[PDB]
């Protein structure tokens, strides 16, 4: 936004990605925003979980969900109408959803 760029020391780097919640709506889907002092790194289809929320904790205790990116600091989440109203707290991180070579074989097949 401005020309400045702070002058602190190194903080971010390595390890998974994370973000903070500045404001979220209780809709289906709902539109949430990120913290000015934070950056988002998820695309339409990624997954995120809740950390320490006030009121809207049910999300954290219900496994991660799928997000939607509307903009740089704008984005939506799954249906959050079946939970309490967001009061405070709430950290959005990037869960480690399955991404390995998982396969299943019910029948038997040795040599065709």
Curated annotation (Swiss-Prot):
Q: Let me know which tissues express this protein, per UniProt.
A: Ubiquitously expressed. In testis, expressed in A spermatogonia and spermatids but at very low levels in pachytene spermatocytes.
Annotated compartments: Cytoplasm; Mitochondrion; Nucleus
Q: Which domain of life is it from?
A: Eukaryota
Coiled coil (UniProt feature): none
Q: How is it modified after translation?
A: ISGylated.
Inducing stimuli: May be modulated by the thyroid hormone receptor.
Subunit relationships: Monomer. Interacts with GAN (via BTB domain).
- Say what the protein does: Catalyzes the first step in ubiquitin conjugation to mark cellular proteins for degradation through the ubiquitin-proteasome system. Activates ubiquitin by first adenylating its C-terminal glycine residue with ATP, and thereafter linking this residue to the side chain of a cysteine residue in E1, yielding a ubiquitin-E1 thioester and free AMP. Essential for the formation of radiation-induced foci, timely DNA repair and for response to replication stress. Promotes the recruitment of TP53BP1 and BRCA1 at DNA damage sites.
Family indicated by similarity: Belongs to the ubiquitin-activating E1 family.
**What name does UniProt use for this protein?**
Ubiquitin-like modifier-activating enzyme 1
> Lineage from the top down?
Eukaryota, Metazoa, Chordata, Craniata, Vertebrata
Quote the gene name from the UniProt entry: Uba1
